[PDB]
Ligand binder design. Structure first.
Ligand SMILES: [Mg+2]
Ligand SMILES: [Zn+2]
Ligand SMILES: [Zn+2]
Ligand SMILES: [Zn+2]
Ligand SMILES: [Zn+2]
Ligand SMILES: [Zn+2]
Ligand SMILES: [Zn+2]
Lengths: 76, 76
């Protein structure tokens, strides 16, 4: 199966790449979205943080990993 | 175990690699098959599209991801 199937970002991170955690939007504490997806969505007043990913894939557009209100303009 | 052969393709994609979505053959909207397997199969009149994968692996030969009549000639 493909990582961007079903309208999901799936941008792939290297081990030391930064991304965003958003405690307001996440399904669980391992979820995260890429900086572009964060910047093209609405997380005003959310409890978000820049994190080091340890690799992985962006969850934006995946409703089983991230609340849809937290999707960016390209995956909403 | 082996990655390919044994009636399974398993080709692994990078983030930006293209592949084929075939809505006629897919088990679900996140499935995809690699360009060689698409070109070695029968998708005449199927509703297929070239897509960007976001990584992942080819579903050709995996009956839980892809209808067998959409398997290429090399993965049964
Ligand atoms: Mg036709
Ligand atoms: Zn993203
Ligand atoms: Zn997004
Ligand atoms: Zn948020
Ligand atoms: Zn293949
Ligand atoms: Zn094949
Ligand atoms: Zn097909």
């Amino acid at each position: 199966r493909r990582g961007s199937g079903g309208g999901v970002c799936g941008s792939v991170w290297g081990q030391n790449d930064i991304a965003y955690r958003c405690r307001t939007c996440e399904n669980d504490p391992t979820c995260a979205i890429c900086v572009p997806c964060f910047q093209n969505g609405d997380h005003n007043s959310h409890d978000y943080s820049i994190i080091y990913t340890g690799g992985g894939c962006c969850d934006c557009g995946d409703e089983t990993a991230w609340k849809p209100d937290g999707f960016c303009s390209n995956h909403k």
